[PDB]
């Protein structure tokens, strides 16, 4: 409805904290006159546009807590993105990211990271990625991960972890350290066994979610999935499963 000029000018003159520029055909953030003068705004929505980059100028939006780039064509993020010290919610879903910039893990307030439908893999993650220990929800579904790095175990505030439809061949035993987890999505990968340490998690309730269908599970595990998720968790806690799991690797 409103022009981009009016959105910027009204945000500034009335000290308004949220700016909605979703679905406006924007191909370059530098084209939006005055956008980077809004050092006070807390929410910027640029979903459903045609961005292919995010300029380093993003660092001038120092008050941002919510940044939504869902469904653009973004191919890389500037390293300056990690200077957003108030950023709590970052939605980069449905873009074309193959890497995250060095220092990305330096974001001190990040709670929700949506990276669904990109082209990320374990090699995409910078060295300091798992210093993001404020994270409570990490959405990585429909990416290209083949393994999950063991430092995932550092993210002990995580309540939601989505790894749906990646290419995972294993889960690290360090997943067992995520004792606040309520939702784990691992359906649609290439998983054959589960680390016994996943049995440390209670994902059996109506309140918890464990989605794990559509994996090439070994026969004993597949048999337990037929009986129900609680049966899977009991099985992988057993000493006999620990025995066979150790032998199956070798």
UniProtKB/Swiss-Prot annotation:
Region Disordered, as annotated, extends over 1-23
Entry's Gene Ontology cellular component terms: cytosol; extracellular exosome; focal adhesion
Highest rank taxon of the organism:
Eukaryota
Report each LRR repeat as a residue range: 40-62, 63-84, 86-108, 109-132, 134-155, 157-178, 180-201
Show the ranges annotated as biased composition (Basic and acidic residues).
Answer: 6-23
Give UniProt keywords alphabetically: Acetylation, Leucine-rich repeat, Repeat
InterPro entries linked:
Leu-rich_rpt, Leu-rich_rpt_typical-subtyp, LRR_dom_sf, LRR_domain-containing, LRR_R13L4/SHOC2-like
Q: What does this protein do?
A: Potentially plays a role in the Ras signal transduction pathway. Capable of suppressing v-Ras transformation in vitro.
Protein name (Swiss-Prot/TrEMBL): Ras suppressor protein 1
Taxonomic source organism:
Homo sapiens
């Amino acid at each position: 409805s409103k022009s981009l000029k009016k959105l910027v000018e009204e945000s500034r003159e009335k000290n308004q904290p949220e700016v909605d520029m979703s679905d406006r055909g924007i191909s370059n953030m530098l084209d939006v006159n005055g956008l980077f003068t809004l050092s006070h705004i807390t929410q910027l929505v640029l979903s459903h546009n045609k961005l292919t980059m995010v300029p380093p100028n993003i660092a001038e939006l120092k008050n941002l807590e919510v940044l939504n780039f869902f469904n653009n064509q973004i191919e890389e993020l500037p390293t300056q993105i990690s200077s957003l010290q108030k950023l709590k919610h970052l939605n980069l879903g449905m873009n074309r990211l193959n890497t995250l910039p060095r220092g990305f893990g330096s974001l001190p307030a990040l709670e929700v990271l949506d990276l669904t439908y990109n082209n990320l893999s374990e090699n995409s993650l910078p060295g300091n990625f798992f210093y993001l220990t404020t994270l409570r929800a990490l959405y990585l579904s429909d990416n290209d991960f083949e393994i999950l790095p063991p430092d995932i175990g550092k993210l002990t505030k995580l309540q939601i972890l989505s790894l749906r439809d990646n290419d995972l061949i294993s889960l690290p035993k360090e997943i067992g350290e995520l004792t606040q987890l309520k939702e784990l999505h691992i359906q649609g990968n290439r998983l054959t066994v589960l680390p016994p340490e996943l049995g440390n998690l209670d994902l059996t309730g109506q309140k918890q979610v464990f989605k794990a269908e559509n994996n090439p599970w070994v026969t004993p595990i597949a048999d337990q999935f037929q009986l129900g998720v609680s049966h899977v968790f009991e099985y992988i806690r057993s000493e006999t499963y620990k025995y066979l799991y150790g032998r199956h690797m070798q």
